[PDB]
């Protein structure tokens, strides 16, 4: 069946499996660094502001306990494609929670795929996004926390959607809920159990707000970045697996076509030699 065409398509699958197999190696190499970076940066000042605020008894007595009617969603996704199904899951969950009720979420995306995938379903809702992050570090994550602070004044709540890197092969989507600056300052000024006199409360309230916001942001990026390489490695493994299976199947058909070719040509030679 036109052996020349089959042998070409078999060559293409071989290259795909090759490059697919190579990207898997890089996926594991980068996952190693992310895991090393995550383990070193994880649980950094996480829950600290939450713990002390809970330790503040007088604050809880006067804590304004209401349900935020309008919140801000900041999903975290990878910018490079062919990273796995983690991006599809994040854009899927936010799509469900957003498609249900519209005009109640700002939906500031993070990552090319996260923003691109949510551009068409939610036009006029997402206005800006962050992409092309050179590296993950606290100074950068703080700049991201500031941008969310500027856009969080309009909404009564802020939450981040990202993948949680619980295992090298298991990444579960996890979402944190963070209150805006306005609610935090009004809530923080009631702090009385923990003295703040070295810097005055008017300054400490704003400074500790950044720590409360950047810590969650910085932690989420690591979990998502680690899940990216983890999900990418698995994707290349499954992709390379499928590439090999198909390549082997075509090899059988190529041999079958080879036998038919010899049979066809051989009968022609015998037909001419008969007469």
């Amino acid at each position: 069946a036109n052996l020349k065409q089959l042998k070409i398509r078999m060559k293409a699958i071989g290259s795909i499996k090759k490059i697919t197999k190579a990207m898997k190696m890089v996926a594991a190499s980068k996952m190693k660094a992310e895991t090393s970076r995550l383990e070193n940066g994880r649980n950094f000042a996480v829950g600290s502001v939450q713990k002390m605020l809970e330790n503040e008894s007088y604050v809880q007595k006067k804590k304004s306990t209401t349900a935020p009617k309008s919140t801000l969603l900041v999903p975290i996704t990878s910018d490079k494609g062919l990273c796995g199904s983690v991006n599809s899951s994040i854009v899927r969950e936010v799509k469900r929670l957003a498609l249900n009720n519209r005009s109640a979420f700002g939906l500031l995306p993070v990552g090319e795929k996260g923003s691109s995938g949510l551009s068409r379903p939610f036009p006029d809702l997402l206005k800006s996004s962050i992409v092309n992050i050179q590296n993950v570090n606290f100074p950068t994550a703080a700049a991201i926390a500031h941008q969310v602070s500027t856009q969080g004044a309009g909404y009564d709540q802020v939450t981040l959607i990202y993948n949680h890197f619980k295992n090298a092969i298991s990444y579960v989507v996890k979402h944190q809920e963070l209150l805006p600056r306005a609610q935090f300052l009004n809530l923080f000024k009631y702090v009385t159990r923990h003295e703040a006199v070295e810097p005055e409360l008017e300054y400490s309230k704003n400074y500790f707000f950044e720590l409360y916001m950047a810590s969650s942001v910085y932690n989420a990026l690591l979990n998502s970045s680690a899940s990216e390489q983890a999900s990418r490695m698995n994707a290349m493994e499954n992709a390379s697996k499928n590439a090999g299976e198909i390549l082997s199947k075509l090899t059988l058909d190529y041999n079958k076509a080879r036998q038919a070719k010899i049979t066809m040509e051989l009968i022609e030679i015998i037909s001419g030699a008969s007469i």
């Binding site: 041999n255 079958k256 036998q259 049979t263 051989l266 015998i270």
Partner: protein
């Protein structure tokens, strides 16, 4: 017919001596190939991929004369060469139909210092 020559020498010990014989035969591909060459020269129309129409008969004779009898037995350890790496080729295909066991020799094991060439997994 050189393959049958060794078989005849073995059949002597099988029947007369009544003792077990071990018949080593070079890769059967050249055996089946010679049968195809002689067939073409004699003027017989070749098979699908050039083999002789008497492949089953020519090969069945050798594969059947090698068995266990009441007087003795002739165990044949013959190599198998797959032309063009095509397992569906008539020569290896018809041969596998008769083979009871297969001894696959692996090159990797030799490098590690282990020098039984037989592969434990590939062998069946």
């Amino acid at each position: 017919r050189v393959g049958l020559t060794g078989l005849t020498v073995a059949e002597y010990f099988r029947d007369e001596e009544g003792k077990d014989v071990l018949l080593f035969v070079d890769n059967i591909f050249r055996f089946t190939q010679a049968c195809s060459e002689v067939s073409a020269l004699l003027g017989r129309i070749p098979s699908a991929v050039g083999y002789q129409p008497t492949l089953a008969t020519d090969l069945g004779a050798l594969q059947e004369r090698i068995t266990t009898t009441q007087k003795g037995s002739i165990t044949s350890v013959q190599a198998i060469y797959v032309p063009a790496d095509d397992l569906t080729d008539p020569a290896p295909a018809t041969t596998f139909a008769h083979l009871d066991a297969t001894t696959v020799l692996n090159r990797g094991l030799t490098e590690l210092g282990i020098y039984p060439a037989v592969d434990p997994l590939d062998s069946t």
